[PDB]
């Protein structure tokens, strides 16, 4: 769904 992960942005799939 096109999500922008910017620098330093922790991102969790679960």
């Amino acid at each position, epitope marked *: *769904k*096109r*999500i*922008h992960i910017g*620098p*330093g942005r*922790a*991102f969790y799939t*679960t």
Partner: antibody
Framework: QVQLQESGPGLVKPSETLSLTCTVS????????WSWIRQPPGKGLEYIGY???????SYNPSLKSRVSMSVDTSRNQFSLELSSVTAADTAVYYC?????????????????????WGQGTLVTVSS | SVLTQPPSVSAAPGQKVTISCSGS????????VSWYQQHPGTAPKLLIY???KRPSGIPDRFSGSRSGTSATLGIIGLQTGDEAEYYC??????????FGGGTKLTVLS
């Protein structure tokens, strides 16, 4: 505040395996994709691949038959293993933290850049 | 290589310059560009991300833009300290991050 530090052998015999580790401090592996990028002396930069904190990976097709990466969240470290090395693999290796675009279809994570970089470690493939 | 940049650019101190990054539909056309500054002997440093965003610490005289399948790094008010190798990068459909060959910026002295 987050700092990355490479740890490598320095010299490696051709045909043998190159093993590197990156230690993340002042932060954690959790929630990020991590990569290794190398630069032969005087030449350009080459992305090797990325690994998500959970273990999923994606490697540069040009190195897929020789590379693998792993992660150890308990030590906040991730590693690189490059087999059958030759002089073409002589270069400064950097570990880095990634950012980019994530798709919920199949493209998954698309690494567009690196915001945090280790200081780099020179790996020389020679007898 | 997938991304192409002119090998070198130069201008006098106080002047401004631009650095091209030529890509294609498989990379810049679908993904955002990031730029780096590298002083020989040290690691690349993130200058621009998401085509035009500047991280904290990078002065506003550094800018980035993207159009079609190409991108541009602009540097205003050149200072001797700006001399370094500049690289553009992004994700390519071949399933990997690709870097341009790098542009050497010389501040004419």
């Amino acid at each position: 505040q987050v700092q990355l530090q490479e740890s490598g052998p320095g010299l490696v015999k051709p045909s043998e395996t190159l093993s590197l580790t990156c230690t993340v401090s002042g932060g954690s592996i959790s929630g990020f994709h991590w990569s290794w990028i190398r630069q032969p002396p005087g030449k350009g930069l080459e992305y090797i691949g990325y690994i998500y904190y959970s273990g999923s990976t994606s490697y540069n097709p040009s190195l897929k038959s020789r590379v693998s990466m792993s992660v150890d969240t308990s030590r906040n470290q991730f590693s690189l293993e490059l087999s059958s090395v030759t002089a073409a693999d002589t270069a400064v290796y950097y570990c880095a933290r990634d950012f980019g675009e994530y798709h919920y279809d199949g493209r998954g994570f698309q690494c567009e850049g690196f915001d945090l970089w280790g200081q780099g470690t020179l790996v020389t493939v020679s007898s | 290589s997938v991304l192409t940049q002119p090998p070198s650019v130069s201008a006098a101190p106080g002047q401004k310059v631009t650095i091209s990054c030529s890509g294609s539909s498989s990379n810049i056309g679908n993904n955002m560009v990031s730029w780096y500054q590298q002083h020989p002997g040290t690691a690349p440093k993130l200058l621009i991300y998401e085509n035009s965003k500047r991280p904290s610490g990078i002065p506003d005289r550094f800018s980035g833009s993207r159009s079609g399948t190409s991108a541009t790094l602009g540097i205003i008010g050149l200072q001797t300290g700006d001399e370094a190798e500049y690289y553009c990068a992004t994700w390519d459909g071949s399933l990997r991050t690709v870097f341009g060959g790098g542009t050497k910026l010389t501040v004419l002295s």
